[PDB]
C-alpha cells in the first residue's frame, strides 16, 4: 500500500493553468493560483476590461487561445491577435449552437477547429474563452448552463485547456427601463459552483476595482 512519489509529479501537469495579471494578484494564495483552471469575470464593460485582455492576450509560442466571440468584438479584423483562434458564427450565438460546437470540439478537435479556419494544427490549445454568457440567458436555463459547464469541464480534462468566461453584472438583467425586474450576476450555481475564481469588476468612483467573489 506504500506510495512514494517522484517530486516531479507535483510540478508537472497535462493541464494548463491561468496566470493572473497584476490587476488580479492578492486575491487568492500562491497555492490557489498554482491551479486556476476555471475563471469567471463579471464586468459591466461591453468590450473586455484591461485585466480580461491581459488574461487572454497571453500566447507563449506555438500555443493558441480559442475565443468563442458571441459578441463579435475579439474577432473583428482590427482586434484580432496572432495567439488566438476565433469562433464567431451565426451557428454559435445561442446556447444550443454553442453546446453543439463544444461537443464537436471534445469529440473531434480537428473538425471543430476547422470551423474556426485553422489551416494548420501545429499548436497546443491553451485556453477557451467565452464572451458573453449573459447573451445565452425559468428552470430550463439551469439545465443548459449545467450542460455547458459539464462540456467545458470535459474539455479541460481531455485537452488540458483552462476556461475563462465573462458575463454582465446584475444590472444588464434588469432590462430596458427595469422591465425585466446570490452573486452580482445572474448565472446559476450549477455553473458558478464550478468556477475556481470568480472575479467582479466594478467602478466605485471612476476607479475600476477587481475583487474576488467567493459569494
Amino acid at each position: 500500500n506504500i506510495r512514494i512519489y517522484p517530486l516531479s509529479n507535483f510540478i508537472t501537469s497535462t493541464k494548463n493553468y491561468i496566470n493572473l495579471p497584476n490587476e488580479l494578484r492578492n486575491l487568492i494564495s500562491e497555492e490557489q493560483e498554482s491551479k486556476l483552471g476555471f475563471l469567471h469575470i463579471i464586468e459591466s464593460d461591453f468590450k473586455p476590461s484591461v485585466a480580461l485582455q491581459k488574461l487572454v492576450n497571453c500566447t507563449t509560442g506555438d500555443e493558441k487561445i480559442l475565443i468563442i466571440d458571441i459578441v463579435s468584438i475579439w474577432s473583428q479584423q482590427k482586434q484580432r491577435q496572432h495567439g488566438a483562434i476565433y469562433m464567431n458564427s451565426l451557428s454559435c450565438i445561442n446556447i444550443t449552437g454553442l453546446i453543439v460546437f463544444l461537443e464537436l470540439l471534445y469529440d473531434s478537435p480537428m473538425d471543430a477547429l476547422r470551423r474556426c479556419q485553422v489551416d494548420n494544427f501545429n499548436f497546443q490549445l491553451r485556453g477557451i474563452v467565452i464572451d458573453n454568457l449573459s447573451f445565452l440567458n425559468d428552470v430550463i436555463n439551469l439545465s443548459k448552463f449545467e450542460k455547458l459547464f459539464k462540456i467545458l469541464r470535459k474539455l479541460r480534462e481531455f485537452l488540458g485547456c483552462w476556461i475563462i468566461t465573462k458575463s454582465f453584472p446584475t444590472d444588464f438583467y434588469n432590462g430596458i427601463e427595469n422591465t425585466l425586474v446570490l452573486y452580482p450576476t445572474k448565472l446559476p450555481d450549477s455553473y458558478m459552483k464550478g468556477m475556481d475564481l470568480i472575479i467582479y469588476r466594478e467602478v466605485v468612483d471612476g476607479r475600476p476595482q477587481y475583487r474576488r467573489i467567493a459569494a
Binding site: 461591453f46 458564427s89 432590462g175 430596458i176
Partner: protein, 191 residues
C-alpha cells in the same frame, strides 16, 4: 465605408448631415453601396434629400435606385428585414463566383419598435428578439468576406442617451433602449 463600426449609434443627426452622409457614401465609385433605411414612422427626410441630391440630375439616378425604404413597426418585422438582408448578402457572396456590395443598414425608431412588441408580447420576448437581431447584425457585419458587407447605424434622439452625455463630463428608472444598446450592443457613438 470601412470607417464604420459593426453597430454605431448616431444621436439626433440633423437632416442635412444625414443627407450628406448618404450622398457621400452612395456616390463612391467602383463599389455598389446601398442604404436600407428602416424606420417606424415613414419619416425619411425626402424633401431635404431632394434638395441636396436632386433626382433630376442624371448623376443622382443610381443613388435613388440604391436607397431602399421600409416602415417597420415592431421587432418581429425588424427580424424579418434582417432575414431579407442576410438573404441578399448570402446570395451576393455565392454569386461572386463583379463589384463589391456595401450595405448601410440605418434604423430610426428602434425604441418605438421595442415599445410596440413589448406591449404585443412580453418583456422577456422583446429583449430576446432585440438581442437576437442585434447579435445577428454584428456577426453579419463582422464577416471577413470582400464581396459583400453590412454596417449598421442606429439613430436615437439625444435625450434618450443621457447616460452618455452625463458620463462625457437627473432621475432615472433603468436604461432607455438607447442607453442599453450603447452599453451592451454598439461599438461606438458618433456625435
Amino acid at each position: 465605408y470601412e470607417d464604420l463600426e459593426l453597430i454605431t449609434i448616431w444621436p439626433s443627426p440633423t437632416k442635412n448631415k444625414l443627407c450628406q452622409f448618404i450622398k457621400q457614401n452612395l456616390s463612391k465609385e467602383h463599389v455598389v453601396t446601398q442604404l436600407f433605411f428602416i424606420d417606424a414612422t415613414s419619416s425619411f427626410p425626402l424633401s431635404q434629400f431632394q434638395k441636396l441630391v436632386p433626382p433630376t440630375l442624371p448623376e443622382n439616378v443610381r443613388i435613388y435606385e440604391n436607397i431602399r425604404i421600409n416602415t417597420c413597426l415592431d421587432l418581429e418585422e425588424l427580424s424579418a428585414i434582417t432575414v431579407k438582408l442576410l438573404q441578399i448578402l448570402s446570395m451576393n457572396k455565392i454569386n461572386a463566383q463583379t463589384e463589391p456590395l456595401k450595405i448601410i443598414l440605418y434604423i430610426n425608431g428602434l425604441e418605438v419598435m421595442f415599445r410596440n412588441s413589448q406591449f404585443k408580447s412580453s418583456p422577456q420576448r422583446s429583449h430576446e428578439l432585440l438581442r437576437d437581431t442585434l447579435l445577428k447584425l454584428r456577426v453579419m457585419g463582422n464577416d471577413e468576406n470582400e464581396n459583400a458587407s453590412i454596417r449598421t447605424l442606429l439613430e436615437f434622439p439625444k435625450e434618450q442617451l443621457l447616460d452618455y452625455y452625463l458620463k462625457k463630463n437627473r432621475i432615472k428608472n433603468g436604461d432607455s433602449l438607447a442607453e442599453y444598446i450603447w452599453k451592451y450592443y454598439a461599438d461606438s457613438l458618433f456625435e
